[PDB]
Pantothenate kinase
Amino acid sequence: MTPYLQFDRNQWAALRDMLSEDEIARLKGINEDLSLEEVAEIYLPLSRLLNFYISSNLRRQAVLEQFLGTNQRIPYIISIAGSVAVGKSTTARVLQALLSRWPEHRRVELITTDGFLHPNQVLKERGLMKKKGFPESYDMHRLVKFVSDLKSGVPNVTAPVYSHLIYDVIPDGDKTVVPDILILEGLNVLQSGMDYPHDPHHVFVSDFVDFSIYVDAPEDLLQTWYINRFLKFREGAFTDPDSYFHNYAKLTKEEAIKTAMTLWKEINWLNLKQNILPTRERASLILTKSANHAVEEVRLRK
Amino acid sequence: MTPYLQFDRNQWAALRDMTLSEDEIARLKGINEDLSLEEVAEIYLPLSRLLNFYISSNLRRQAVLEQFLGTNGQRIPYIISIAGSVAVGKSTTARVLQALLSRWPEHRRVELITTDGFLHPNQVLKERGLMKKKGFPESYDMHRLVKFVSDLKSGVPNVTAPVYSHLIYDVIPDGDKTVVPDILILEGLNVLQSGMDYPHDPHHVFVSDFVDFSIYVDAPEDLLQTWYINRFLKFREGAFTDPDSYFHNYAKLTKEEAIKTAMTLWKEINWLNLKQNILPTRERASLILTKSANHAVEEVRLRK
Ligand SMILES: Nc1ncnc2c1ncn2[C@@H]1O[C@H](COP(=O)(O)OP(=O)(O)O)[C@@H](O)[C@H]1O
Ligand SMILES: Nc1ncnc2c1ncn2[C@@H]1O[C@H](COP(=O)(O)OP(=O)(O)O)[C@@H](O)[C@H]1O
Ligand SMILES: CC(C)(CO)[C@@H](O)C(=O)NCCC(=O)O
Ligand SMILES: CC(C)(CO)[C@@H](O)C(=O)NCCC(=O)O
């Protein structure tokens, strides 16, 4: 047996017994390629599950508040891990939208770990410009302190912001979080001190996370999704010489595809095998994706 | 602000509204003759109440989820771990909590397992030249400890754990203990450690990943040394007429030199272990129980 309850697509979709015109438009605005049937059969039930954990947490809090005689609101935190291009950003944003359906979750914030990467200046200095996503490219102590402060009750917490448009951290663009729920999305949210032997931390991100989800998918599908996303970014930079991807418009489509393929195999895939995939069993829930991003399996810790 | 709610002794003791039976009082004395009954009433009863709230909350949610997921799965044991320095009082704390948690009709089975049993036998330790490193990461068969709590959290009906004997100073060759429980208390100095502590043989899912609530018993080095030495002395005294005891070896030394010997085991082995491997894991605990003179609890910190 394993520490996980398992559900194939049908079993998971069977969990349903809930979307409005505004809500359907918002989901399409999130990702035009997002299937409404996928949302209805997979993500709605997932948001319900999450709400049960959150509700349970809120009720516990009230019972303990009475017993302990205390006076403070602390954000419930959900992290989302997985390979680059597996769909963390889409999953996070979909969950942010759905969790907003409950009157209790008036404020659902979303922060990605991309922002906590060391700026390109610093990475170049360390010779890590070809290692974005790897442990050493992150200012981990800062990421840990971010969730630590939130879990300490600090009213306003600030997070750095990254721009895939300029391919670097935005100098003066730090975002200020003022939330009932915080969704932390990043390939490294399940990593820990062992992943940073060069600069170890002893309290991990997971130590300040209530529920963690690992989005999973085969290497062959991840490669395809990565490349197709790359191509979209390239196309979108054809008339924007200020865009980082405008550098790929000079290449023929064919050489651009090979370039993307090389970025995937030598950087992102290597990162997946050495640092990301090994953290999968630390997740509260594993979301296994299949062709066309269809979820085929859901595993939840017993 | 910190990730912890804080309570000094008085504020904590103020959490109590409970009366202990004559049999319950007899059991506590039996657990440890020096355990203050007042201490139990003002510190440990409230702590057992707190734990019960977390456990209850877990059981209720399990019901809500069973209904939703339609998975009338196996009952999974709620696991509580207790960490801290050698001689801080983990064993006493665990046994006291085991007794108190038994008061609720819901917690019929409250098992207690110590990680000492998961140490590599002396033979293995000697061949690896680690006989002077008991308690350090490399002296543990960590993969086995991880699998133990992993199996419990997988719903495995009966799980077996190796057992250690402080009297023979080694793993008991054929004394494995079989756990068949609503609650499992896992006591050990290394329950909060992780992969980073075992670079020589890394694991990627930690003990804490299978623990519901963790407690770190904390105390100053000066008090820990005193408690360690006094426990050592009682161990030596108990071995005076037992040539089949590990501590008989110390009966040959004058009390004075026996104390210095004990003091040396403390400083060069246990204290070093505390500084390099145990103390750093403290902030990973759900609750920090800080003891002071005579083992009196002076502070309690609980994760917000
Ligand atoms: N559920 C989904 N349905 C359809 N396309 C998806 C889905 N999730 C992700 N994608 C697409 O696949 C790619 C990877 O998702 P993205 O969120 O950018 O990855 P990540 O944040 O994990 O790096 C994007 O091109 C995105 O539009
Ligand atoms: N609450 C307590 N009150 C009085 N004495 C205690 C208490 N807890 C522990 N002790 C004593 O202090 C010593 C250390 O406790 P012990 O449980 O053996 O340590 P550990 O399991 O952490 O190695 C023992 O000699 C024990 O009798
Ligand atoms: C910032 C990450 C790691 C995650 O979002 C990714 O966008 C990235 O830049 N990876 C490095 C190799 C690449 O895809 O260019
Ligand atoms: C078994 C441990 C590691 C913890 O219970 C400790 O009691 C031990 O025997 N080793 C430290 C050296 C000593 O006190 O003899």
